[PDB]
């Protein structure tokens, strides 16, 4: 029951990465889009990655066109869009992006089947179905672009955030969890 059963192809199509490569690391899975209202979170995700990389955080981005069709581009067009359009201004992610694919429905990526079903969903509301480009609909489906899952260094899911939760709050929660683990380790030895 770990993420190490799975892997994904990098966005340039050149390398399949088994998630076992992230053994010993905290992994933050984020489904992404280039034309979302939350696409500015890319800037904050870069900052989070740079700040917490020393403590074992790895961010992985999964482009998905299932939420308002907000990732229309081919895989080769995604990095250019981020750099020159939105966020634009020369932006380049400092974390790994993978090929575009489904996160919900019959053709969803299997590691997302695992992740989605490991934690309760992020809201009671699925939303209006016209905006949700998949079938069938299920209680634990990802609700929108930029939903987030934290997986621990043992490959086991820890927690899941609503897409609109700020990246600062996500950071604060990761740090708190890492501190609790450190403290709980020290305390177990004294005991």
Pick 97 or 132: Cβ nearer Na ion: 132
Pick 2 or 77: Cβ nearer Cl ion: 77
CB within 8 A of 63, min separation 6: which ones? 11, 31, 32, 33, 34, 71, 75, 78, 97, 98, 99, 100, 101
Give residues in contact with Cl ion (CB under 5 A): 36-38, 145
Pick 122 or 145: Cβ nearer Cl ion: 145
Contact call for residue 147 and its own copies (CB under 8 A): no
Contact call for residue 107 and its own copies (CB under 8 A): no
Which of the stretches 10-18, 39-47, 123-131, 183-191 binds its own copies when contact is defined by CB under 8 A? 123-131
Cα separation, 8 vs 152, in Å, equals 18
Give residues in contact with Na ion (CB under 5 A): 129, 132
**Are the C-beta atoms of residues 87 and 39 closer than 8 Å to each other?**
yes
Question: Among Na ion, Cl ion, its own copies, none, what does residue 145 contact (CB within 5–8 Å per kind)?
Answer: Cl ion
CB within 8 A of 153, min separation 6: which ones? 23, 24, 25, 26, 56
Q: Which residues pair with 176 in a beta bridge?
A: none
Structure tokens at 82: 């981020």
Rounded to the nearest whole angstrom, what is the least distance from the CB of residue 165 to its own copies in the complex? 18
Pick 22 or 67: Cβ nearer Cl ion: 67
Query: Where along the sequence are the contacts to its own copies (CB under 8 A)?
Result: 121, 124-130, 132, 135-140
């Amino acid at each position: 029951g770990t993420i190490y059963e799975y892997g994904a192809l990098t966005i340039d199509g050149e390398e399949y990465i088994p998630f076992k490569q992230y053994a010993g690391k905290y992994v933050l899975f984020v489904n992404v889009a280039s034309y979302g209202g939350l696409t500015g979170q890319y800037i904050e995700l870069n900052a989070l990655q740079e700040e917490l990389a020393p403590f074992g955080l790895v961010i992985l981005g999964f482009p998905c066109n299932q939420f308002g069709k907000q990732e229309p581009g081919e895989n080769s067009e995604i990095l250019p869009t981020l750099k020159y359009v939105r966020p634009g201004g020369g932006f380049v992610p400092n974390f790994q992006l993978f090929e575009k694919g489904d996160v919900n429905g019959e053709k969803e990526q299997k590691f997302y089947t695992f992740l989605k079903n490991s934690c309760p969903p992020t809201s009671e509301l699925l939303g209006t179905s016209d905006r949700l480009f998949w079938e069938p609909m299920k209680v634990h489906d990802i609700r929108w672009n930029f939903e987030k899952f934290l997986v621990g260094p043992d490959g086991i899911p820890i927690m899941r955030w609503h897409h609109r939760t700020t990246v600062s709050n996500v950071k604060m929660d990761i740090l708190s969890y890492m501190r609790r683990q450190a403290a709980l380790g020290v305390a177990e030895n004294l005991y």
